[PDB]
């Protein structure tokens, strides 16, 4: 169980929980970043793949964890500050950040603020690279609505599961996210909607980094050729960008193909170790 490595510390004004396996090994540390309205539990299978060979840190955001709570409004900028304060307390210098879906807003901002010495590379998992399509835009609006947020979550679950009876992913969505409420989901809708509005898209944000550096997008969904093409076109244009289609069933490769996620993370960690 990953609750063996679970800690809690005061980060500015808020008590945050975090995973830290405290492995005595060569860097970089692997910094696993949750998306919105879930926690380290998403990474329990991936932690198992990496545990022996890497120091593994998983911050939980304000109001997130085994016992969710209401907190004052914050966004991805604050997530960045919280992450860096945790790393500072732990004495971690070099790290490889790895995000799930909209944890990517945090990862890209973290690359900017931490710089390429501390954060030389990044891995983004299953993160919608294009601007919101009508269906996704509709989901965000429902999440923001105090009357319809739960309907919003159900619609997203349908999409993420993509018609698969995936035991582990279902357990995560239906049990491990069950305690999260409008305070989180509405916030996630406001933050993500604004992130797209202000930064245009994940691809725009990444291209606008002061110091571009190796980033790989590893994803299972969406499955359509048109999505593969935008990743391929971006990779043609930018030497520092690469991708891999993982062929996993759901939006949660960290859960359904953790072995595959781990080989990409290991490749990037090895590259860092060698200069
Ligand atoms: Xe979302």
- Measured at the alpha carbon of residue 105, what is the angle toward residues 235 and 203, in degrees to the nearest 5? 25
Ligand 1 binding pocket includes 21 (Cβ within 6 Å): no
Ligand 1 binding pocket includes 192 (Cβ within 6 Å): yes
Is the CB of residue 31 less than 8 Å from the CB of residue 87? yes
Query: How many of the other CB atoms lie within 10 Å of CB of 225?
Result: 8
Active site residue 251: yes
Specify the DSSP class assigned to residue 62: T
Complete domains list, the chain, with CATH: 2-130+201-273 (3.40.50.1820)
Residue 165, C-beta contacts closer than 8 angstroms, at least 6 positions apart: none
101 labeled part of a ligand binding site:
yes
State the alpha helices, DSSP H only, in the chain: 44-50, 76-90, 104-118, 134-144, 149-161, 167-171, 182-199, 202-207, 225-237, 253-256, 258-273
Residue 148, C-beta contacts closer than 8 angstroms, at least 6 positions apart: 142
Retrieve residue 91's tokens.
Answer: 């004495």
Ligand 1 binding pocket includes 101 (Cβ within 6 Å): no
Residue of 40, 102, 172, 251 with catalytic role: 251
Q: How far is the CA of 9 from the centre of ligand 1 (A)?
A: 27
Q: How far is the CA of 102 from the centre of ligand 1 (A)?
A: 7
Report the C-alpha gap between 123 and 120 in whole angstroms: 11
Report the C-alpha gap between 186 and 82 in whole angstroms: 21
Strand-pair category, 95-100 with 241-245: unpaired
- Measured at the alpha carbon of residue 188, what is the angle toward residues 182 and 194, in degrees to the nearest 5? 135
37 labeled part of a ligand binding site:
yes
Ligand 1 binding pocket includes 246 (Cβ within 6 Å): no
């Amino acid at each position: 169980m990953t609750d063996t490595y679970l800690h809690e510390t005061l980060v500015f004004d808020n008590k945050l929980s975090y995973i830290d396996n405290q492995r005595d090994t060569d860097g970089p540390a692997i910094l696993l970043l949750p998306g919105w309205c879930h926690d380290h539990r998403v990474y329990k299978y991936l932690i198992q793949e990496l545990d022996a060979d890497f120091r593994v840190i998983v911050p939980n955001w304000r109001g997130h964890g085994l016992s969710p709570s209401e907190v004052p409004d914050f966004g991805y900028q604050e997530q960045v500050k919280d992450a860096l304060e945790i790393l500072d307390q732990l004495g971690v210098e070099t790290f490889l950040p790895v995000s799930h879906s909209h944890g990517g807003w945090v990862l890209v901002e973290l690359l900017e603020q931490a710089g390429p010495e501390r954060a030389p590379r990044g891995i983004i998992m299953d993160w919608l690279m294009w601007a919101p399509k009508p269906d996704f835009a509709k989901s965000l609006t429902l999440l923001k609505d105090p009357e319809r947020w739960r309907e919003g979550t159900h619609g997203l679950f349908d999409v993420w599961l993509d018609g698969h009876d995936e035991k582990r992913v279902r357990h995560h969505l239906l049990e491990e996210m069950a305690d999260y409420g409008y305070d989180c989901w509405g916030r996630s809708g406001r933050v993500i909607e604004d992130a797209y509005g202000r930064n245009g898209s994940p691809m725009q944000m990444m291209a606008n980094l002061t110091k571009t550096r190796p980033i790989r997008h590893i994803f299972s969904q969406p499955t359509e050729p048109e999505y593969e093409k935008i990743n391929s076109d971006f990779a043609e244009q930018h030497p520092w960008f690469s991708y891999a289609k993982l062929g996993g069933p759901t939006h949660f490769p960290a859960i359904d193909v953790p072995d595959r996620a781990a080989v990409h993370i290991r490749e990037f960690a090895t590259a860092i170790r060698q200069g």
